[PDB]
Design a protein around this nucleic acid. Structure first.
Ligand SMILES: [Mg+2]
Ligand SMILES: [Mg+2]
Ligand SMILES: [Mg+2]
Ligand SMILES: [Mg+2]
Ligand SMILES: [Mg+2]
Ligand SMILES: [Mg+2]
Ligand SMILES: [Mg+2]
Ligand SMILES: [Mg+2]
Ligand SMILES: [Mg+2]
Ligand SMILES: [Mg+2]
Ligand SMILES: [Mg+2]
Ligand SMILES: [Mg+2]
Ligand SMILES: [Mg+2]
Ligand SMILES: [Mg+2]
Ligand SMILES: [Mg+2]
Ligand SMILES: [Mg+2]
Ligand SMILES: [Mg+2]
Ligand SMILES: [Mg+2]
Ligand SMILES: [Mg+2]
Ligand SMILES: [Mg+2]
Ligand SMILES: [Mg+2]
Ligand SMILES: [Mg+2]
Ligand SMILES: [Mg+2]
Ligand SMILES: [Mg+2]
Ligand SMILES: [Mg+2]
Lengths: 185, 168, 257
RNA sequence: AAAUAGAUCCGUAACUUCGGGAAAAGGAUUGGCUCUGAGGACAUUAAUGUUAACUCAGAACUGAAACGGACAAGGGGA
RNA sequence: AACCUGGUUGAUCUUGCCAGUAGUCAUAUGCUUGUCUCAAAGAUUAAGCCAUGCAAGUGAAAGUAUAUAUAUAUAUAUGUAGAAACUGCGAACGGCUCAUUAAAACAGUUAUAGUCUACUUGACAUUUAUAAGGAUAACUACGGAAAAGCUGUAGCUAAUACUUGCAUUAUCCUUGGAUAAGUAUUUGUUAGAAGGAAUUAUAACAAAGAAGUAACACGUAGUGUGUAUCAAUCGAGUUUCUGACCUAUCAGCUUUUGAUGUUAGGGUAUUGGCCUAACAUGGCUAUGACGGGUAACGGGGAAUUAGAGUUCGAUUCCGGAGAGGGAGCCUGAGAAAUAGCUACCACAUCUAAGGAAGGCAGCAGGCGCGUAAAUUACCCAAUUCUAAAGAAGAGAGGUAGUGACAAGAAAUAACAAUGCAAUUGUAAUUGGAAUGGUGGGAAUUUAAAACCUUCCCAGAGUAACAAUUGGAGGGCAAGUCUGGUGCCAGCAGCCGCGGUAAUUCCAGCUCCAAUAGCGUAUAUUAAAAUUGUUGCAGUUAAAACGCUCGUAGUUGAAUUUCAAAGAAUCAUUCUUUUUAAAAUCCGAUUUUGUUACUUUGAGUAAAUUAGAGUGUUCAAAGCAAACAGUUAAAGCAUUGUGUUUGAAUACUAUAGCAUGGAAUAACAAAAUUGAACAAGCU
RNA sequence: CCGCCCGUCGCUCCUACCGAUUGAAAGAUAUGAUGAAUUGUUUGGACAAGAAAAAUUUUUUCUGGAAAAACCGUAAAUCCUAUCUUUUAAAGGAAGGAGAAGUCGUAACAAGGUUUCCGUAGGUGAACCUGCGGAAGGAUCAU
């Protein structure tokens, strides 16, 4: 029989292929955050649309209703845990105000750049992909990793990295070798 | 063979059905037993859960009651004289559930020489003029093609008048 | 052919067994016995998925080969035997005793009773028969025939049964103030008392039950089990004592670390 | 010259001046014997008796598979 | 995201279509392709035809052993193993496909007071005995046939195979009497704890009467095998109510030969025109009968959609049907079975010419068909099933191989010094770090390989370890650059371009778009308020019947108890008291027409969907997990013993069951005449 | 207005239509005639075993029983006839659409040189002409 493991899509196409202002805004964001394609912009838009749809449906509902209370508390807790709302704007109306830069600010790439630790955002992307970064004693090499609130003070170099207290790489050791056989010949 | 389904019938509107299923063997219809008057001869047929029913093919005696008193006696069957379904069945002398037969009546008169508490009954006359010749009219009450036996009771009162009038 | 089926597929098994939808196309397919399939669990489920004593099916087999497991004071070697609601389970090698009950969800749990409580169970009557010679036989939910029943025992009430000898100890009536456990849809482990009985003439009968928190629910008459008189229950209960909270309050309680 | 022909029971096209064509074309049956059923009148009281006359249906047996047994009696179609 | 642009004119405002745009768990095909995870795959056309191999068997105390081996005690005894064969159980489950099928099947709701039911579970029994009978496999000897899962004659011998049959009490009136002498089932006469309702459990009287209650095995008071009836369980057969696509250039249909009813039988496991005999003249239909069509199996569901809707569902689960096409039948608890049998039609195999043997819509595989689809591989380790039930078997099932169907993550550099334009850019030149892809070896994984993770060794500069597919007049983002051709060749979804100075053809360069992906063809949804219930238009653009009457259908004036008086509340919300009448407590309780409609409950399969919890390194997923500790504290049971968990909730017709109700709507009761009550009456 | 435009006739290509041929082919349904196999009853009785003097014989009885027949049923298949459905050939006849500088006239658009149209009937190479009744969408909202 067919397998029982299912799957789903994460992006959606703009429906209007050659609109000038949207295209310019997309290039803005891609250049600012150092991304690869339009597909990443579209995945973030997809996620934000799901969030906003849930918030709208909850808001049209009656006050002191059990459904609203349960699901609104769950959604607000999830949002504040993600680091998108804060401390004094947890009221289910500030959900509708979340914009694209807010979500895009929580990527491990942006966080690695902003905390010193890298000279740019392209440097930040290349370091993550080369096994140099940890998030709390677990090594992460995926630049779309979204950092939660209580995990953002634990970003640091990895113990197995030459930038984090280990042996040097394949280039240093070969140069040192050539120097050794130079000085002992 | 014979089936008992309704897929070959017409609808109550008069339209005809399309068959898309074969016969299923849990609607068997096996052929009839034509029990006749003669020396005992009974066969065996097995039903679904290996439940046996007995096919009589020839019988000439049974157990017959006198309903007024509540007494039963084994006796001999002489003839068949009437059948309400069709009289082609008295012509071949076949025994079925609701036949009218004639039986030997000596065992019943002999038993009346114990004269249980029906001792003030005043036997009706027509039964006495029947007793004089030694034969009476009875009605079968069992199903010989299912139980293998032929049992019945003596006819009395208005039923006797009905069946006397039907036979003239 | 078209005879009786012998296989059971995993996604078609009753949902309260809680089986993994990966790893297999089949489910154990309990045998025929004292309980219905949908109101019971096979012994392999109890002995591998719940108690975790076994890792595979063949290990359950090797456990049962050595006669160390008893249900209702009799050893059983069938890997798909049905166990059911009020039955007691004894394991000699570990010296353990259990009674199966519903929790506040719809799933079975082993309750870990003590040795003294392991000598009886509660059976509810389903019908009473009169047979040759004018003797009366009661039929219980357990699929069990009790001859020489007391004349005051009726169809819907429960009785307390000794296990060493199949005799009756006492019987508990079915009234307006009796204590009850409910055993089917939308409320499967709730314990309340009783408030009223309806008796609709040609159709089902509805009865109403009040919690100890003054919450009221209703169900059919056929899924009501009497477990005590007005004051106290006659068996020990799991830790919630059949008190069901709504999802908001349950979430609030769970948030204590 | 041959083939068909009496009755009963089924089934009948094109075309048409709607009346026909039509016995269109085609198909089945038919003896003897033994039985069952249905069709009237009269006079004494739902009962009882007395009495006809020819037709029409159904069934079981029977024979070298024959039965409008001789006589009598359309061939059809485009 | 509840959206629109180009095209009729010299120019304008409309109706109206054509073209453009985006999605598809939607098929095919063209160009191109470095890494990992996940995994659809001969449905469409031909329910077309098949070489070869496999796909259902089974003995660990417990039916039968001088086939024959073997141990111990000493010719004897007690044991262990066992080719063949008889006996027992299973083979009616599983797997495959979608041809038939339009009140049929199916779905939700009912009934069986009209039935059958193996294995498993609980109750529990009636009219020579120190142990009965004969006969048959395997086996031995003599054989036949080209051939086959062919078998003849003769002689032996067992059983839980096939049979016969012994020994015993119970109840009513501190001995006897009557005896009971019969489980299911059938006939006749009666009496009568439960269900809404009994011709019900049950009891008596008179006739019949199956089948049974151990002439069995193990050595654990204990089991195995077998057995009459009742009950349970795993199921089935029938059955109530409601629910489908297109067509009226399908309007009347059914009934001689069962169509619709009644009476009596037959048959079946039971009811029934299911069948037979007699009798009556019924049954359905414009609210669409009877027919035709479907490139129609139904459902759980899928795609796209603001809300309405439109289209799909061969294919993981449930139900149905079939095994080349039809019809019959045996065994059995269960079959109208097809890797069971018998015959015909078609197709086809071997032959010594007499004869014998067939069914891939099971798993691989082949031919044909076509636009359209993979290995004649490994294993029973997991999920389960069958058996004489640890231990055997299973193309069920799992694992790999092929595989740009579909889905998720994600490389093709980064950084300095100098030089040069505006802190910056890099357009340019130099130098050192970082790192996979790749080759080798291991720790692991796994039935055994293999993949993924992890570690060691070798390993980038034109980092040649070199990204593509479509476009550049407008719609629509991007050249008025350079050569060739010259209404030819060609391009162009639409408007259009091309006739010697082409922004559109053929090329070079340069730019734009998406990017390990991007084009093209057919179908389908939105766009389409261009099918309009929400929500169109009908003087002149397409469109009011020549006119009136009329049945079905659709729609229909106003009126019957209206109020008042408080409180708890930031004017408002929520409520507390009852002002007519009659029938149940010696001035207190509650009852006072039906439906539609609306409120609240019950009952319901998962998968899919919505949705709560949880860092698969993230995500698509999954249903799991979390906590202390170089090896212990601490806790709770007296030296023992890890602890805390989660797998929620909603949804599941339009019909059906229960339930509060004051508005709106319908129906009832309502006069050339009708009630109530008091008192003499039969 | 040296504008626009209408129809017959001649040529080429493509699509559908009528059509003698009692045209042809493939299916489906119904009646009829034959009718393999087989459930059930009856007939039949190769021989197997019992009850009878015996010399390892004949006769009687009971019982069980194979081959083969008959009948009522369940009924594949073949053939003839009659309809219905789908596809399809053909002398000849007669339309529509597309194309090419063709021939003949000038019906419509201006009062288009006889205002234009509707219904009906007759006639003519063609567009068209004429009779009877109607409309303005007229070339007159008026004496
Ligand atoms: Mg079948
Ligand atoms: Mg296992
Ligand atoms: Mg003629
Ligand atoms: Mg115009
Ligand atoms: Mg099956
Ligand atoms: Mg009749
Ligand atoms: Mg389907
Ligand atoms: Mg198909
Ligand atoms: Mg398939
Ligand atoms: Mg299926
Ligand atoms: Mg085939
Ligand atoms: Mg078959
Ligand atoms: Mg096969
Ligand atoms: Mg065959
Ligand atoms: Mg195959
Ligand atoms: Mg393909
Ligand atoms: Mg054993
Ligand atoms: Mg082994
Ligand atoms: Mg170019
Ligand atoms: Mg559309
Ligand atoms: Mg629309
Ligand atoms: Mg719309
Ligand atoms: Mg319109
Ligand atoms: Mg008008
Ligand atoms: Mg003119």
């Amino acid at each position: 029989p067919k397998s029982y493991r299912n799957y789903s899509k994460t992006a959606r196409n703009p429906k209007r292929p050659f609109e000038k202002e949207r295209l310019d805004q997309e290039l803005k964001l891609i250049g600012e955050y150092g991304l690869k394609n339009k597909r990443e912009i579209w995945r973030v838009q997809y996620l934000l649309a799901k969030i906003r749809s849930a918030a709208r449906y909850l808001l049209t509902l009656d006050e002191k209703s059990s459904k609203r209370i349960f699901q609104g508390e769950a959604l607000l807790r999830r949002m504040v845990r993600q680091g998108l709302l804060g401390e004094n704007e947890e009221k289910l109306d500030y959900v509708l105000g979340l914009t694209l830069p807010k979500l895009l600010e929580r990527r491990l790439q942006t966080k690695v750049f902003k905390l010193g630790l890298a000279k740019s955002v392209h440097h930040a992307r290349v370091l993550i992909r080369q096994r140099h970064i940890r998030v709390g004693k677990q090594m992460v090499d995926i630049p779309s990793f979204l950092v939660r609130v209580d995990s953002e003070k634990h970003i640091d170099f990895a113990t197995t990295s030459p930038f984090g207290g280990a042996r040097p790489g394949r280039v240093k050791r070969k140069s040192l070798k050539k120097q050794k056989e130079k000085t002992e010949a | 063979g014979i089936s008992r389904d309704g897929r070959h019938k017409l609808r109550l509107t008069g339209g005809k059905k399309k068959i898309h299923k074969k016969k299923r063997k849990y609607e068997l219809g096996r052929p009839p037993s034509n029990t006749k008057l003669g020396s005992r001869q009974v066969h065996v047929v097995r039903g679904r859960g290996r439940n046996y029913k007995y096919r009589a093919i020839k019988l000439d005696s049974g157990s017959f009651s006198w309903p007024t008193f509540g007494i039963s006696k084994n006796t001999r069957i002489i003839d068949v004289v009437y059948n309400a379904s069709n009289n082609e069945l008295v012509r071949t002398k076949t025994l079925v559930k609701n036949c009218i037969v004639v039986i030997d009546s000596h065992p019943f008169t002999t038993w009346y020489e114990n004269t249980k508490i029906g001792k003030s009954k005043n036997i009706d006359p027509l039964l006495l003029e029947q007793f004089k010749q030694g034969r009476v009219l009875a009605c079968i009450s069992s199903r010989p093609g299912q139980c293998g036996k032929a049992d019945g009771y003596i006819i009395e009162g208005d039923e006797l008048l009905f069946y006397k009038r039907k036979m003239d | 052919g078209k005879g009786i089926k012998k296989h059971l597929k995993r996604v078609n098994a009753p949902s309260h067994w809680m089986l993994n939808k990966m790893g297999g196309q089949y489910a154990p397919k309990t045998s025929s016995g004292p309980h219905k399939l949908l109101e019971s669990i096979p012994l392999v489920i109890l002995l591998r998925n719940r108690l975790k004593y076994a890792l595979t099916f063949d290990e359950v087999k090797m456990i049962l080969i050595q006669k160390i497991v008893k249900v209702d004071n009799k050893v059983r070697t069938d890997c798909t035997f049905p166990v059911g609601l009020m039955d007691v389970i004894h394991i000699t090698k570990s010296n353990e005793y259990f009674r199966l009950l519903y929790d506040i969800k719809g799933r079975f749990v082993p309750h870990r009773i003590t040795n003294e409580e392991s000598k009886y169970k509660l059976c509810k009557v389903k019908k009473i028969l009169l047979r040759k010679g004018r003797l009366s036989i009661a039929v219980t939910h357990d699929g069990r025939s009790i001859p020489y029943i007391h004349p005051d025992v009726k169809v819907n009430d429960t009785v307390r049964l000794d296990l060493e000898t199949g005799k009756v100890l006492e019987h508990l009536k079915f009234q307006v103030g009796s204590l009850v456990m409910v055993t089917a849809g939308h409320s499967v482990g709730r314990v309340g008392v009783i408030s009223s009985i309806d008796k609709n003439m040609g159709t089902y009968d509805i009865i109403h039950v009040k919690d100890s928190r003054n919450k009221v629910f209703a169900t059919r008459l056929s899924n009501v089990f009497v477990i005590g008189d007005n004051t106290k229950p006659y068996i020990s209960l799991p830790r919630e004592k059949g008190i069901k909270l709504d999802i908001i309050e349950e979430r609030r309680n769970r948030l204590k670390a």
